[PDB]
Amino acid sequence: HMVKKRVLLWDYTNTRDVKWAMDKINFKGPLHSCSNWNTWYPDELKHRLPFRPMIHGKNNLTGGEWQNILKTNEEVIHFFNEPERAGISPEEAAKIWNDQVLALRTSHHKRLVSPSCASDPAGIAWIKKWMNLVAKNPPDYLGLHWYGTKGDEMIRYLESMHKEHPHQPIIVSEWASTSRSYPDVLGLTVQLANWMDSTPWVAEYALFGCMRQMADDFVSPEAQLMNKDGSFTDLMWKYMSDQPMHI
Ligand SMILES: OC[C@H]1O[C@@H](O[C@@H]2[C@@H](O)[C@H](O[C@@H]3[C@@H](O)[C@H](O)O[C@H](CO)[C@H]3O)O[C@H](CO)[C@H]2O)[C@H](O)[C@@H](O)[C@@H]1O
Ligand SMILES: OC[C@H]1O[C@@H](O[C@@H]2[C@@H](O)[C@H](O)O[C@H](CO)[C@H]2O)[C@H](O)[C@@H](O)[C@@H]1O
């Protein structure tokens, strides 16, 4: 049976500039859901996959941003994106969770993803502290990011975080190879897709790079899932079409 755990990360620049690109997505392959780092829904999706709204940061707790979260028909909602790098302490995020976000479960019966921190000591320590602070009202999923060049190290990290936090499944809300060598990008992507596909405690995983411009200097141009014209790279085709993935 077709294993369907792959998330379509749909950056708002796609919605802003190249809506039409969504209609070129393959929906008959292992794509299973969609997120866009925002509270609001990408209309061009036309409900062809479940959407996970995100409470990205403190700017998304009030006004029309919070109204989008309160009114959504979608089942799963992400909390803060890399809060350890936006000056949000574990204690401050635990308070906002109890006072405001938890109601989305107790009252609106949504499932909640923990904040997704970076795979560095600062991030590992942040999520360790926050999960302890809200242990009496834990999240439904543990949200993880991972960027690097060695697939064996991402596997060891997921296995490591699953042992440290064994009470819920893991969502990899962002991951990618940062290698500038395309064979090493393709090799890691294929390895981790197939490994996570056959690992029950990984609910879903979200490959980064489906946008026209480079996000920053950190991510690899060889790992891009969209060309500058808005067409899809061969890596994107394989991601959304092939199960198992192959090089
Ligand atoms: O700051 C730029 C960029 O950083 C991203 O986080 C990275 C981590 O992905 C990276 O992870 C390392 C792995 O690549 C490596 O294989 O293993 C080590 C541990 O042995 C990991 O730490 O670590 C660096 C810190 O040196 C982080 O910068 C963020 O997710 C991203 O948002 C940001 O753009
Ligand atoms: O096989 C998993 C690992 O793949 C590595 O890339 C390989 C390259 O080093 C080599 O040159 O080519 C093969 C395919 O011909 C690649 O698979 C990645 O660099 C690793 O991160 C990954 O774990």
Side-chain angles (χ1 to χ4, degrees):
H1 309 273
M2 166 91 68
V3 182
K4 305 208 281 195
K5 295 192 177 182
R6 299 192 193 158
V7 182
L8 175 61
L9 291 173
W10 200 249
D11 190 77
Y12 83 95
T13 62
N14 293 335
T15 304
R16 188 190 64 198
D17 301 336
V18 289
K19 281 170 219 295
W20 55 261
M22 181 63 87
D23 284 333
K24 296 208 172 302
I25 291 289
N26 179 0
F27 293 104
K28 289 170 197 202
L31 284 184
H32 136 98
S33 61
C34 171
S35 70
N36 73 352
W37 293 278
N38 283 280
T39 63
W40 51 262
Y41 184 92
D43 291 353
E44 61 268 28
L45 182 51
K46 286 186 275 198
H47 296 97
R48 289 180 276 188
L49 300 164
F51 173 74
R52 288 85 160 81
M54 183 171 294
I55 309 155
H56 179 90
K58 275 165 63 64
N59 57 110
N60 303 105
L61 298 176
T62 72
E65 288 300 308
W66 189 244
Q67 291 314 127
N68 293 333
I69 294 294
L70 286 181
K71 96 183 209 215
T72 188
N73 262 339
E74 303 290 345
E75 242 85 37
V76 182
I77 299 178
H78 285 279
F79 202 20
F80 291 142
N81 176 83
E82 299 197 337
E84 77 276 22
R85 305 195 170 197
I88 298 167
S89 66
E91 294 83 18
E92 195 186 343
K95 189 188 162 64
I96 291 162
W97 174 266
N98 292 316
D99 286 5
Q100 177 173 0
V101 179
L102 231 201
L104 297 177
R105 183 156 68 202
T106 71
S107 173
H108 294 216
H109 295 287
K110 309 304 192 170
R111 280 196 290 183
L112 301 175
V113 192
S114 75
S116 295
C117 300
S119 50
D120 63 13
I124 295 172
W126 193 102
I127 196 61
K128 175 174 165 100
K129 195 166 198 195
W130 181 88
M131 289 285 279
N132 186 249
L133 279 168
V134 305
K136 275 157 188 192
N137 295 279
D140 295 279
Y141 302 100
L142 178 56
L144 295 183
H145 295 165
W146 191 97
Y147 298 98
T149 65
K150 282 151 195 204
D152 291 357
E153 264 196 316
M154 183 171 168
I155 291 171
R156 190 166 307 116
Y157 175 68
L158 291 181
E159 271 171 349
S160 168
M161 290 305 266
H162 174 54
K163 193 178 168 182
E164 186 75 4
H165 303 291
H167 299 317
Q168 60 278 309
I170 281 159
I171 291 182
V172 187
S173 47
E174 301 179 22
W175 70 287
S177 176
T178 51
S179 182
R180 265 60 177 170
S181 172
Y182 183 69
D184 293 283
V185 168
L186 184 53
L188 185 154
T189 304
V190 164
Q191 185 195 7
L192 265 283
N194 291 336
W195 185 89
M196 286 192 288
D197 277 352
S198 46
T199 299
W201 47 262
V202 174
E204 56 182 29
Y205 56 82
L207 189 70
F208 189 93
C210 200
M211 47 194 304
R212 279 158 90 218
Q213 306 300 310
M214 306 306 306
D216 57 40
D217 289 321
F218 174 79
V219 294
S220 172
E222 310 303 331
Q224 284 293 98
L225 302 176
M226 195 177 272
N227 295 308
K228 273 148 198 200
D229 66 352
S231 67
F232 294 133
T233 69
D234 191 65
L235 184 65
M236 181 52 176
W237 177 265
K238 288 178 154 57
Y239 179 63
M240 73 179 180
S241 301
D242 299 348
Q243 199 283 292
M245 276 199 87
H246 62 87
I247 68 174

